[PDB]
Amino acid sequence: AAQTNAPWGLARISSTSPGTSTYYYDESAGQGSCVYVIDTGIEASHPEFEGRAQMVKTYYYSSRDGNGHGTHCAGTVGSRTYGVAKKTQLFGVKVLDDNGSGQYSTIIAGMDFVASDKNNRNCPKGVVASLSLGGGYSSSVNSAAARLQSSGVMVAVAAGNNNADARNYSPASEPSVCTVGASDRYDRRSSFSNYGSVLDIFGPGTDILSTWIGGSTRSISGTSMATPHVAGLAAYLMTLGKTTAASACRYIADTANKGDLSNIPFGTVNLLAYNNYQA
Numbered sequence: 001a002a003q004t005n006a007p008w009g010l011a012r013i014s015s016t017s018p019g020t021s022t023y024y025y026d027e028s029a030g031q032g033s034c035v036y037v038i039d040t041g042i043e044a045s046h047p048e049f050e051g052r053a054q055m056v057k058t059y060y061y062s063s064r065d066g067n068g069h070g071t072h073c074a075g076t077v078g079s080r081t082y083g084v085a086k087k088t089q090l091f092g093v094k095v096l097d098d099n100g101s102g103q104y105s106t107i108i109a110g111m112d113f114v115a116s117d118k119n120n121r122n123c124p125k126g127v128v129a130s131l132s133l134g135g136g137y138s139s140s141v142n143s144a145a146a147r148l149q150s151s152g153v154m155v156a157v158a159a160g161n162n163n164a165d166a167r168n169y170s171p172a173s174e175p176s177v178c179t180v181g182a183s184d185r186y187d188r189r190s191s192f193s194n195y196g197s198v199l200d201i202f203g204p205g206t207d208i209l210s211t212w213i214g215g216s217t218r219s220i221s222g223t224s225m226a227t228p229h230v231a232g233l234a235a236y237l238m239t240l241g242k243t244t245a246a247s248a249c250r251y252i253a254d255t256a257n258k259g260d261l262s263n264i265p266f267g268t269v270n271l272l273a274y275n276n277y278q279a
């Protein structure tokens with residue numbers, strides 16, 4: 001399949017070079033996989049989700065996404081126009097309030113919720129969780145992310161937006177998950193992206209068009225936007241049978257575009273997520 005005039009990040013993850021505009025992908029499109037978006041919620045009624053999104057848990061008064069951030073991330077995972085894995089199932093877990101903030105105890109609870117809830121869901125191609133959130137280092141937060149991964153979920157987490165070493169942020173600093181930095185459409189490390197030895201991969205994160213609340217769309221930037229590209233790529237590759245939840249981060253790193261990015265500090269991987277789709 002080939003989506004013309006796609007958002008630049010979708011085109012980028014199907015090309016060895018920057019500057020293209022078509023997203024080339026296998027039509028299976030993540031069918032049969034499931035992605036939990038652990039965030040401010042998902043506006044499941046958005047036409048771009050085509051009935052494939054639903055809220056499964058909220059830690060606040062409502063399950064509504066009153067912010068937009070979670071809806072945007074979910075759209076990059078799996079919306080029709082803006083998503084990597086256009087046929088995946090999306091499950092929303094609202095651990096962040098409508099200002100985009102959440103206490104670590106609640107974020108931890110949401111991770112352990114996913115680890116259990118996936119045993120209620122029919123996800124024959126496997127389960128992914130996308131965590132476009134974080135704060136300062138916390139061993140408890142890291143341990144929760146490690147448990148979620150251990151339980152059989154491909155966990156992708158944002159590196160953070162501090163232009164600093166991700167070792168000092170959580171869940172970014174948990175080794176066993178997939179820690180995602182951000183790049184721009186000229187293959188530069190995004191100006192805000194964290195870096196460091198703990199990063200596994202980069203994805204598109206500057207000026208990413210996706211869904212928003214009120215049935216709308218907008219373009220925003222962050223490692224929060226790079227993370228769902230990787231989560232959606234994992235779901236897509238799992239549906240194709242190329243990898244598993246335990247091995248997908250390593251597989252994505254194996255198969256990434258290597259050495260394409262600029263302003264990568266020595267000791268940080270120079271790896272950009274790539275679907276290696278060959279029609």
Ligand SMILES: [Ca+2]
Nearest residue numbers: 016017257260
């Ligand atoms: Ca290249």
Ligand SMILES: [Ca+2]
Nearest residue numbers: 175176177200
């Ligand atoms: Ca890792």
